[PDB]
A and B are shown apart, each in its own frame.
Chain A
């Protein structure tokens, strides 16, 4: 009922070797992965390494490129559009949790903190 399956374990971070770097023609899902990674790294900077999940997820956006590129679906392009708002809401929620802040103050802090960190990230993109 069953083929011969042999897993070739290797020690260490080998995963980068497995990435398929070749871009789709229209609506690259991989490009979506890159933008989402950038947004997640921004939220990780704001939350200031108090939340390693965001960094891990940014890392996964790279790992996801083990699957060959294809055009993105509409649910995928909408999710990438909704991501910023959703990260801001997480930061907001976290700031009500950790600090005393009322929801609307937390949201205002989150939006401004995110916008500013996003600008710094963009202006620190290398040549």
Chain B
């Protein structure tokens, strides 16, 4: 069977693990959220052909910087993640994540993925963001960064509401089946 290996990468607390659990189980986790997603593989039918899809989470904290890339070999697509209510995480896409994956997997395509979009329209998050100056990241400014850093595209989702969730992984599968 042909195999798609997808690796999810990004800052701590952006929602990497929950995005993976909500997508694979169709449930948002509150009771069991490991730091790194449990081992997962599934059958995907793509144009009548069966593919193995393997989804790999990572630990984004700098303590693991020398251990994290052990899971990069043979990766077919990366998901580079940031929360749309964390400008800090958006910044690290440019300065840490894309430099990291392109140093190890220099021709492997990647999507830029915005997470937690249900917090864009939640006052307390905007309230907290107004203090020390920040606003949520918009699809516009995020699409620019994706053009700049040569991501396949920008996609967006909420693990909590499941909005856009299916599409993120459809696009990833497509980006994996490429030149």
Contacts and interface: CB of A to CB of B under 8 A. Distances in A.
Interface of A: 2-11, 13-15, 17-18, 20, 29, 36, 40, 52-54, 56-57, 59-64, 66-68, 70, 72-73, 75-76, 79, 82-83, 86-87, 89-90, 93-94
Interface residues of B, number: 41
List the 7 closest A-B pairs by CB distance, nearest first: A56-B36, A3-B47, A15-B41, A18-B41, A67-B74, A6-B45, A86-B66
Contacts of B67: 40, 53-54, 57, 83, 86-87, 90
Given A63-B56, A79-B69, A57 B36 contact: yes
Interface in B47-70: 47-48, 52-54, 56-57, 59, 63-64, 66-67, 69-70
B46 A3 contact: yes
A5 B5 contact: no
Given A63-B39, A66-B5, A9 B46 contact: no
A59 B73 CA distance: 15
